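Before the break, one more example. Copy the sequence into your notebook; we will annotate it together after we see the structure.
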Amino acid sequence: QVQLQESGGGLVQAGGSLRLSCAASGRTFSSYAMAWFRQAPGKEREFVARISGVGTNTYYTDSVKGRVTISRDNAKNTVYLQMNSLKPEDTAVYYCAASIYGYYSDTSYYTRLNNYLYWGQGTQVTVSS
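Here is what the structure looks like once it is written out:
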């Protein structure tokens, strides 16, 4: 058995900063994959990051490399992201969810709605000027 929690979620204007996090309780996170997705208005949904509970073969968006911080801990089973100088292209709803897994090259093998143990609680980002 595991529990999930979400924090830091909020809406901040252009040139400001935003910090996002997901946390899990229990020691079996090595069989629960976290996945991050983005919904931009007028477009289809896209993937952002693929988080593996064993600490191996993780994926993330390279377009923000060195502009954001990404922190992950397999002892605590927690995830923290930090973002600075927000822009109009960041205007979206972000989602995080956790599903039962063993190993992957893509979270699409474990993105079934029955295999997600916990999902929703998305963060909308409202940008101005």
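The CA atoms of residues 2 and 28 lie 7 Å apart. The longest strand covers residues 17-25. Try to locate both features in your own notes.
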